[PDB]
RNA sequence: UAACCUAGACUUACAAGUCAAAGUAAAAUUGACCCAGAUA
RNA sequence: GUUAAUGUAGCUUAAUACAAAGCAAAGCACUGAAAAUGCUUAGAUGGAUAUCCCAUAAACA
């Protein structure tokens, strides 16, 4: 319970489609910018972290 | 501890491979799924090579080259037939042609399909030659001093699997000249069916002790009937096994081509056959009235028509 | 017309019929053993210290094309056994036989140190320039 | 009965100097058809061990002659029978 | 920087250098075996005597 | 992003989630569902 | 001469065929040493049969 290493965040598409998915990142690292498949545009687009959900 | 321990992986790998090759009591994968004067001359030439300083230095530069053409000709004379026999065995010619009988080739047979006049494409063992390149009969040359040469399409038959068709058969060939051979079978261009894969065509040379009239094997010229081109090598060779001993081989693989369309229609005068490779239907367990713990896709697996039906409605 | 008669099903007996088409089966198991066996053909180079021999073998275990430095034709024109120049020529000779044999696609499985070797990288260079493909195409399902 | 395994502790004021003899003595040891199970290094001068297994009266005489000749410079030899 | 001829000469002397060391080691390597066998042969001789 | 599909199995109130031959397709310190949210 | 040895390359009962084989052993490069790896080196049927054979060398002599 006390131990806390990673965190869960929302990765939101930069294409404006509103598609989002959750990914795990280390708490002490910088915000993630990832290239992920967006079903709405049916092609890989850049995703940027917006908010933290919980402590993993 | 008395035995030494391998200092490198290679020593273990080489020993392991040798151990695998040797049979063992325990079940293994393989069972389930499977003169003097010349030597003195050779040494003398080798010693001359040793003496040559240029060759010595040519090797320290680690760029020395070898003439492939000289090696190829010499290789055929000395140990090439053993390699040639392996090619036929792997390709299944012996099992399909002579019902498993094996003959070591001895005649260095050479065949090439002439393209125009500038160059001629050779026909080696297992080579790939397009049907267009085989539109006309090839040039045959071999060093010898009678002879009979035969042409086969081993897997080109369209009616009977065991049978095969002759492209052309020359008989009573005197020494090297081939123009004097009797044209029992007129030349026919390759006709491998579309979508039927790669067809192997093999050229056979048989030593003739005495001239024998092959009246039974004579065929009308020109002949466009497959029903009369059908034959068997085994029985044909059995009838003439007394005076025929095979000594030459040459085979190539060819696909379907636009020229094959011409061959089927223009002279064969029949519709071209078209085949497709059909894989076995996927295996599905017997359908259950209640597919417990199964997705909705379960119904789709056992359905045949993708269009809705209404029955009484 | 008598010609028009054709059997519904073709019966091709060529062992390489499906392999050349690319539909023939390749062994896909043996995950716990090295090297992988998902090859229609394999290049086996056994340097056996002094002499260098190269083999081409089908999955069934029958060697198809073999080039060895002991062979009289090569040795008379070949100065010395296993070395950088050993595969500089026999590999080229093997390639010509491979082209002669019609095997354009083959699989080579060298070890890490062997791959880093000098008499193997040049052998691969000799094969690729000759047009022999050291990587076979993927099977068609 | 046969000679036991005798260890030679290459003791020198420099680890490289003992290394230089360790490289050569071991090189000659293999030339002497000797088996070297281990090559231990003592704690700080620096001393290095070159295990030698398999000796004989005649072998020792030929071996010790080689060991003396192999002495490059300022290295102190030692012969001790293993426990 | 060494010229290719200079490297060529240095490489050559390594080749003969390799041969010289090889011959000495082979003769010296086998000499040891005879001496060890010779001592064992003498041990057999004494055993025959007593 | 770490897939889908599909023999045969696990886990499980239900549901979802797992392992996996074949097939196909991208590429080369919690754990689901219910149930409530956010919005469309 | 009687007993006895010894005769493919350190080892092998590799081989006599389509090789006179494999292994051991050797040098340099590569820096802890060693080993590995890469590049390199040197070699034989003194000889037969499926026991004679001559040579060689011992106890008897």
Curated annotation (Swiss-Prot), chain B:
* Regions annotated as coiled coil: 36-59
Where does it primarily localize?
mitochondrion
Coiled coil is among the record's keywords: yes
Q: Which GO terms describe its biological process?
A: mitochondrial translation
Mind listing the UniProt keywords for this protein, alphabetically?
A: Coiled coil, Mitochondrion, Ribonucleoprotein, Ribosomal protein, Transit peptide
Instruction: List locations, semicolon-separated.
Output: Mitochondrion
> Gene Ontology cellular component?
cytosol; mitochondrial inner membrane; mitochondrial large ribosomal subunit; mitochondrial ribosome; mitochondrion
Which PANTHER family does the UniProt record give?
LARGE RIBOSOMAL SUBUNIT PROTEIN ML38, PHOSPHATIDYLETHANOLAMINE-BINDING PROTEIN
The subunit structure is:
Component of the mitochondrial ribosome large subunit (39S) which comprises a 16S rRNA and about 50 distinct proteins.
Family named by the database record: Belongs to the phosphatidylethanolamine-binding protein family. Mitochondrion-specific ribosomal protein mL38 subfamily.
Please identify the protein, giving its name as recorded: Large ribosomal subunit protein mL38
The organism is Mus musculus (Mouse)
Gene name of this polypeptide: Mrpl38
Swiss-Prot record, chain C:
Q: Which GO terms describe its cellular component?
A: mitochondrial inner membrane; mitochondrial large ribosomal subunit; mitochondrion
- Taxonomy, superkingdom: Eukaryota
Q: Coiled-coil annotation: which residues?
A: none
Kindly list the residue ranges recorded as spanning the membrane: none
The subcellular location is: Mitochondrion
Q: Which GO terms describe its molecular function?
A: 5S rRNA binding; structural constituent of ribosome
One biological process term from GO is: mitochondrial translation
UniProt KW Transit peptide keyword: yes
Which keywords belong to this entry? Chaperone, Mitochondrion, Ribonucleoprotein, Ribosomal protein, RNA-binding, Transit peptide, Transport
Q: How does it assemble?
A: Component of the mitochondrial ribosome large subunit (39S) which comprises a 16S rRNA and about 50 distinct proteins.
Which family is this sequence assigned to?
A: Belongs to the universal ribosomal protein uL18 family.
This molecule's function is given as: Together with thiosulfate sulfurtransferase (TST), acts as a mitochondrial import factor for the cytosolic 5S rRNA. The precursor form shows RNA chaperone activity; is able to fold the 5S rRNA into an import-competent conformation that is recognized by rhodanese (TST). Both the cytoplasmic and mitochondrial forms are able to bind to the helix IV-loop D in the gamma domain of the 5S rRNA.
Record-given protein name: Large ribosomal subunit protein uL18m
Organism (species): Mus musculus (Mouse)
Q: What is the lineage of its organism?
A: Eukaryota, Metazoa, Chordata, Craniata, Vertebrata
Give the gene symbol: Mrpl18
From Swiss-Prot, chain D:
Which family is annotated? Belongs to the mitochondrion-specific ribosomal protein mL48 family.
What lineage is this protein's organism placed in? Answer: Eukaryota, Metazoa, Chordata, Craniata, Vertebrata
Query: Where is it located?
Result: Mitochondrion
- Gene name tied to this protein: Mrpl48
Q: How does it assemble?
A: Component of the mitochondrial ribosome large subunit (39S) which comprises a 16S rRNA and about 50 distinct proteins. Interacts with OXA1L.
Please identify the protein, giving its name as recorded: Large ribosomal subunit protein mL48
Q: Which residues of the full protein are shown?
A: 85 to 189 of 211
Which parts form a coiled-coil structure per UniProt?
Answer: none
Swiss-Prot record, chain E:
- Coiled-coil residue spans: none
Tissue pattern of expression reads: Ubiquitous.
Provide the species name.
Mus musculus
Binding partners and assembly: Component of the mitochondrial ribosome large subunit (39S) which comprises a 16S rRNA and about 50 distinct proteins.
Per the record, the similarity remark reads: Belongs to the mitochondrion-specific ribosomal protein mL40 family.
The portions of this protein that span the membrane are none
Can you name this protein?
Large ribosomal subunit protein mL40
Q: Where in the cell is it found?
A: Mitochondrion
């Amino acid at each position: 319970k006390s131990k806390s290493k990673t965190i869960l965040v929302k990765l939101v598409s930069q294409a404006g489609t509103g598609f989002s998915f959750n990914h795990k990142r280390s708490r002490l690292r910088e915000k993630l910018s990832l290239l992920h498949y967006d079903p709405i545009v049916n092609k890989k687009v850049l995703f940027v972290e917006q908010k933290k959900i919980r402590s993993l | 501890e008395r035995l030494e321990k391998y200092r490198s992986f290679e020593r273990y790998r080489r020993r392991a491979e040798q151990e695998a090759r040797a049979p063992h009591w325990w079940r293994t994968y393989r069972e389930h799924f499977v003169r003097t004067q010349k030597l003195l001359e050779r040494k003398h030439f080798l010693r001359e090579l040793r003496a040559n300083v240029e060759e010595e230095r040519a090797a320290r530069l680690r760029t020395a080259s070898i003439p492939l053409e000289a090696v190829r000709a010499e290789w055929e004379r000395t140990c090439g037939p053993y390699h040639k026999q392996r090619l036929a065995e792997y390709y299944g010619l012996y099992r399909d042609l002579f019902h498993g009988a094996t003959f070591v080739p001895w005649v260095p047979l050479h065949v090439a399909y002439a393209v125009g006049e500038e160059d001629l494409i050779p026909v080696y063992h297992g080579n790939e030659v397009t049907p267009t390149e085989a539109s006309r009969a090839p040039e045959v040359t071999y060093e010898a001093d009678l002879w009979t040469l035969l042409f086969i399409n081993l897997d080109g038959h369209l009616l009977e699997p065991d049978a095969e068709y002759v492209h052309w058969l020359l008989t009573n060939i005197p020494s090297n000249r081939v123009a004097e051979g009797q044209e029992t079978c007129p030349y026919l261009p390759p006709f491998p069916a579309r979508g039927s894969g790669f067809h192997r065509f093999a050229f056979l040379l048989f030593k003739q002790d005495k001239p024998i009239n092959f009246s039974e094997d004579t065929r009308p010229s020109p002949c466009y009937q497959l029903a009369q081109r059908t034959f068997r090598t085994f029985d044909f060779y059995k009838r003439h096994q007394e005076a025929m001993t095979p000594a030459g081989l040459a085979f190539f693989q060819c696909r379907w081509d636009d020229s094959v369309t011409h061959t089927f229609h223009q002279l064969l005068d029949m519709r071209e056959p078209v085949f497709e490779f059909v894989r076995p239907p996927p295996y599905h367990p017997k359908q259950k009235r209640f597919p417990h713990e199964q997705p909705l896709r379960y119904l789709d697996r056992y359905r045949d028509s993708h269009e809705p039906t209404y029955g009484i409605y | 017309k008598e010609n028009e008669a054709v059997a519904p099903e073709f019966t091709n007996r060529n062992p390489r019929n499906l392999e050349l088409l690319g539909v023939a089966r390749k062994e896909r198991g043996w995950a716990t053993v090295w090297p992988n066996r998902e090859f229609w053909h394999r290049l086996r180079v056994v340097k056996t210290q002094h002499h260098v021999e190269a083999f081409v073998e089908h999955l069934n275990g029958q060697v198809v094309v073999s080039a060895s430095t002991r062979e009289w034709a090569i040795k008379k024109h070949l100065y010395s056994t296993r070395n950088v120049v050993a595969c500089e020529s026999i590999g080229r000779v093997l390639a010509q036989r491979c082209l002669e044999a019609g095997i354009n696609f083959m699989v080579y499985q060298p070890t890490p140190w062997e791959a880093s070797s000098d008499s193997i990288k040049r052998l691969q260079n000799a094969m690729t320039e000759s047009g022999v493909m050291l990587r076979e195409p993927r099977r068609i399902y | 009965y046969e000679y036991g395994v005798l260890n030679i502790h290459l003791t020198a004021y420099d680890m490289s100097l003992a290394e230089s003899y360790a490289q050569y003595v071991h090189r000659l040891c293999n030339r002497l058809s000797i088996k070297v199970e281990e090559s231990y290094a003592m704690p700080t001068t620096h001393e290095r061990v070159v295990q030698i297994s398999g000796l004989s009266a005649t072998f020792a005489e030929i071996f010790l002659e080689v060991l003396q000749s192999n002495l490059p410079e300022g290295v102190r030899l030692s012969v001790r029978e293993h426990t | 920087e060494h010229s290719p001829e200079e490297s060529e000469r240095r490489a050559l002397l390594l080749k003969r250098w390799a041969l010289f060391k090889q011959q000495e080691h082979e003769m010296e390597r086998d000499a040891i075996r005879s001496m060890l066998e010779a001592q064992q042969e003498a041990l057999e001789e004494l055993k025959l005597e007593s």
